[PDB]
């Protein structure tokens, strides 16, 4: 059901979707969205699980 409602189809479309969601109104590039998602997690500094 989720994959049905899932509008996107590709990984880069996932990056741009999450990027727009995080802060609307910004020019979504590959590097911008990719670094944003790699900073939301997968970053020793911007994140830690204690």
């Amino acid at each position: 059901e989720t994959l049905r409602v899932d509008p996107t189809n590709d990984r880069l479309s996932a990056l741009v979707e999450i990027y727009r969601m995080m802060r609307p109104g910004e020019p979504p590039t590959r590097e911008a969205a990719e670094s944003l998602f790699e900073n939301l997690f997968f970053s020793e500094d911007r994140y830690d699980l204690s």
Binding site: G25, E26, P27, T29, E31, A32
Partner: protein, 178 residues
């Protein structure tokens, strides 16, 4: 031939010059010495060489803003925005900037030329306003500016001397409030 149209960025209160320095440093980082060609922060100088504030003072055309000559590409967009302390762009809808038009460009250019050619004393006096005198010979007098002058800069001022009003040439440094 896509020319690098000028653009403007909103800085903080008093970091405009430092923001421009750091922006040139980010240019030298990303080697974008082509796209981010010119970056300018205009200013002015009021030269009142007496009465507290001494010998000069620096103003700005419009504070909080900085002027650049970038181009339009998302990479350069971030490179402008990925600098120490700037707010967003100043123009069209956010994420889609707009250029300061060439008419305004040459206008501000002429203003910059005029302020760069002639360092000129501002904070002038308007004809018909009362004012005290800080002159030696005429200490603690007060009269009305009967006629103002700029290049001669000597303030034709009427004041009560031997009864009836008389015009005097008390220079700027010998002029008190207003």
């Amino acid at each position: 031939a896509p020319k690098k149209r000028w653009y403007v960025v909103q800085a903080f209160s008093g970091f405009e010059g430092r923001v421009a320095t750091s922006l040139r440093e980010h240019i030298k980082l990303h080697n974008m010495e082509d796209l981010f060609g010119e970056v300018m922060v205009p200013t002015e100088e009021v030269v009142e060489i007496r009465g507290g504030q001494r010998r000069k003072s620096e103003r700005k055309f419009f504070p909080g803003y900085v002027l650049v000559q970038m181009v339009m590409n998302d990479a350069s967009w971030h490179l402008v925005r990925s600098v120490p302390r700037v707010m967003g762009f100043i123009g069209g809808t956010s994420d889609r900037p707009a250029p300061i038009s060439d008419k305004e460009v040459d206008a501000i250019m002429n203003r910059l030329q005029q302020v760069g050619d002639k360092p000129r004393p501002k904070t002038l006096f308007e004809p018909g306003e009362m004012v005290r005198v800080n002159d030696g010979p005429f200490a603690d007098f007060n009269g009305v500016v009967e006629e103002v002058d700029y290049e001669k800069s000597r303030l034709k001022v009427s004041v009560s001397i031997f009864g009836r009003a008389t015009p005097v040439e008390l220079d700027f440094s010998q002029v008190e409030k207003a």
